[PDB]
Enzyme design. Structure first.
Site, PDB file in Angstrom:
ATOM      1  N   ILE A 172      22.282 -45.599  12.692  1.00 33.86           N
ATOM      2  CA  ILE A 172      22.802 -46.540  11.706  1.00 33.86           C
ATOM      3  C   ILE A 172      23.555 -45.802  10.605  1.00 33.86           C
ATOM      4  O   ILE A 172      23.009 -44.902   9.969  1.00 33.86           O
ATOM      5  CB  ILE A 172      21.671 -47.373  11.073  1.00 33.86           C
ATOM      6  CG1 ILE A 172      20.875 -48.103  12.159  1.00 33.86           C
ATOM      7  CG2 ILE A 172      22.240 -48.368  10.069  1.00 33.86           C
ATOM      8  CD1 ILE A 172      19.597 -48.745  11.658  1.00 33.86           C
ATOM      9  N   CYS A 173      24.810 -46.188  10.391  1.00 34.09           N
ATOM     10  CA  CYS A 173      25.634 -45.606   9.333  1.00 34.09           C
ATOM     11  C   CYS A 173      25.760 -46.569   8.158  1.00 34.09           C
ATOM     12  O   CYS A 173      26.539 -47.520   8.204  1.00 34.09           O
ATOM     13  CB  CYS A 173      27.021 -45.247   9.867  1.00 34.09           C
ATOM     14  SG  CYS A 173      28.153 -44.604   8.605  1.00 34.09           S
TER      15      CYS A 173
END
Length: 150
Positions: A88-89
């Protein structure tokens, strides 16, 4: 191998967080390794991910909490900000991070991401372009992968 005084702070957050998490979010009891937290995030209603239940794991790196945790979806998902490995960014979080925010804020940020993606920093560039050029196409496939994996 976090410092013991950090571990002591983690046990506090997780214990409180587990007993009373934010809505649609559930942290599972961890007695093995609190550096590796298991969490479920309910797909928000009114989104393509609605109805789905998304398993993820939150990893507290070596320089936690000086640096933000690194989240990973176990559940397969179609989201601009989730990589093939599930990474997850959360671009805005990493910029607006300090040691005081807490693990609760991180989980909330991830939930907000399902509602408000950020194609300016897409790990899934296909989902990134679709979100901008044809939202209905994104909502369709995201909704399809949510029926299968959610």
């Amino acid at each position: 191998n976090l410092p013991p005084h950090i571990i002591r702070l983690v046990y506090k957050e997780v214990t409180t967080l587990t007993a009373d998490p934010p809505d649609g979010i559930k942290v599972f009891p961890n007695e093995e390794d609190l550096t590796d937290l298991q969490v479920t995030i309910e797909g928000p209603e009114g989104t393509p991910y609605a109805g789905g239940l998304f398993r993820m794991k939150l990893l507290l790196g070596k320089d936690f909490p000086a640096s933000p945790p690194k989240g990973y979806f176990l559940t397969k998902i179609f989201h601009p900000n989730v990589g093939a490995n599930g990474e997850i960014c959360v671009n805005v979080l990493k910029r607006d991070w300090t040691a005081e925010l807490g693990i609760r804020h991180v989980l909330l940020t991830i939930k907000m991401l399902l509602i408000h993606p950020n194609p300016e920093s897409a790990l899934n560039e296909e989902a990134g372009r679709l979100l901008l050029e044809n939202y209905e196409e994104y909502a369709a496939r995201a909704r399809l992968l949510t029926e299968i994996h959610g």
